[PDB]
Design a protein around this ligand. Structure first.
Ligand SMILES: [NH3+][C@@H](CCC(=O)N[C@@H](CSCC(=O)c1ccc(-c2ccccc2)cc1)C(=O)NCC(=O)O)C(=O)O
Ligand SMILES: [NH3+][C@@H](CCC(=O)N[C@@H](CSCC(=O)c1ccc(-c2ccccc2)cc1)C(=O)NCC(=O)O)C(=O)O
Ligand SMILES: [Ca+2]
Lengths: 240, 240
């Protein structure tokens, strides 16, 4: 059955799903959608929430911009990750052991509930960096301290998290986001300090997999795509 | 292997996992924690995030207030729901079909990402009710139109969502929450109107299951428990 993923280079959510699909060895189509600046009129037929990513599954082979009513319409990046794991069980995108599977789901929830919001607020609103650094420390503390991925072996939990952590470093080095220069230097100093060695190793470990290389536009390209986001008003910074 | 769930009557998050455990037919212990008013000094050993629910799994049989370092410590309610589904496959707490499983996962993400924060903000900050009503209408649109549960058959997705929806109605009737009188009126009228027939049926159907009845203190008892929650300042309301 066919898979079509509606994507955008500047969407870390869509990135999650690309990574999973790579790890699964899936056959799939990707189709870019200019969701923030010029959504196509047909897009609400694949996702009525008007968000990227969106996925169609099965139905007749059709051009992405002519979706078919017969395909299943699948929304929400984390639901997609679990769906891909269900579709491709021999790819072992989750552990088999219940407790280790629980570590992956807990890690995804920790990221979604306590970290992701802080990234948004700091980068889009320029709120203080310290609560984000705290949340990143908490997340780092859920990793196996001696090495490995969230649940040991690689799982969809690492697909869920690497798109945001991998963007953090080059966006900081490029100055992109609404936070102050002061909070910028503070975040760059923290993320380079020994406080955060474990998370740097994790980013290295996730980035080294072909699933990241093959779904990453390059750091400089990703910075460029991110400047096309209006909520990231380039040249704007909030202070205290 | 033993299951201990650390609970509180006023935690809709813990309520989720009680429902799932009931639907699994599991043997388990529950243990209340006065998490907001007087957390026991040992509680960070079962959950370093200091939130309810917490779960221990396995290790030796010990009193809940003397947790053992050998038990698995499982945090985050949705991770616990998937864990229980994983532990008790014969209970069919998720569909076997992958598209149907994705409906369950999508429904949980729609709730967590667009509805839950509106409930929290309206009840605890008195933010405007209209965005909550719009998010509820969106969630109601994901239900199978003719009846049944989020993924057709009952699944953990309905354990995830019913604690919150089931609380909304008696909380409105008791005037519980920091929203204005006007928005209280608006919400009470909206949730009684034909616009939300479908979600009323959903609420009734979820509530009719023994998993709800056996984990619910009763409408007034839950109202009373909610009033013990600090951030529900009795006598405070916000107006815009
Ligand atoms: N819960 C959904 C969310 C999807 C979503 O919001 N999609 C966006 C894509 S655009 C999000 C994005 O461009 C973005 C960019 C950068 C970051 C970020 C990264 C690193 C550091 C700091 C911040 C975070 C988000 C959309 O379509 N939005 C359209 C709409 O909601 O109308 C899911 O899990 O699929
Ligand atoms: N992501 C976690 C959340 C856990 C959590 O925050 N637990 C609280 C429980 S306190 C009750 C509560 O959170 C709550 C939330 C919403 C309502 C409500 C509002 C409107 C309508 C109906 C019901 C009622 C109660 C805690 O321990 N917090 C302590 C801490 O965060 O330090 C999970 O999924 O387990
Ligand atoms: Ca519908």
């Amino acid at each position: 059955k066919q898979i079509t993923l509606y994507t955008a280079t500047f969407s870390p959510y869509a990135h999650r799903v690309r990574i999973a699909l790579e790890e699964a060895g899936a056959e799939y189509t990707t189709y870019d959608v200019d969701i923030l600046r010029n959504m196509p009129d047909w897009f609400p037929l694949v996702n009525p929430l008007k968000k990227i990513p969106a996925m169609t599954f099965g139905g007749p082979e059709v051009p992405p911009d002519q979706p078919s009513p017969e395909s299943a319409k699948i929304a929400e990046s984390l639901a997609m990750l679990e769906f891909i794991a269900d579709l491709f069980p021999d790819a072992k995108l989750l552990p088999t052991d219940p407790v280790l599977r629980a570590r992956a789901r807990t890690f995804m929830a920790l990221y979604e509930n306590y970290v992701n919001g802080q990234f948004r607020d700091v980068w889009f609103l320029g709120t203080p960096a310290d609560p984000l650094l705290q949340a990143l420390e908490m997340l780092q503390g859920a990793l196996p301290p001696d090495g490995g991925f969230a649940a040991g072996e690689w799982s969809i939990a690492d697909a869920a998290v690497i798109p945001f952590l991998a963007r953090m470093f080059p966006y900081l080095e490029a100055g992109l986001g609404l936070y102050s220069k002061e909070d910028g230097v503070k975040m760059r100093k923290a993320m380079a300090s020994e406080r955060f060695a474990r998370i740097r190793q994790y980013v290295r470990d996730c980035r080294a997999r072909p699933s990241f290389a093959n779904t990453w536009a390059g750091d400089a390209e990703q910075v460029e795509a991110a400047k096309t986001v209006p909520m990231l008003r380039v040249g704007e910074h909030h202070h205290h």
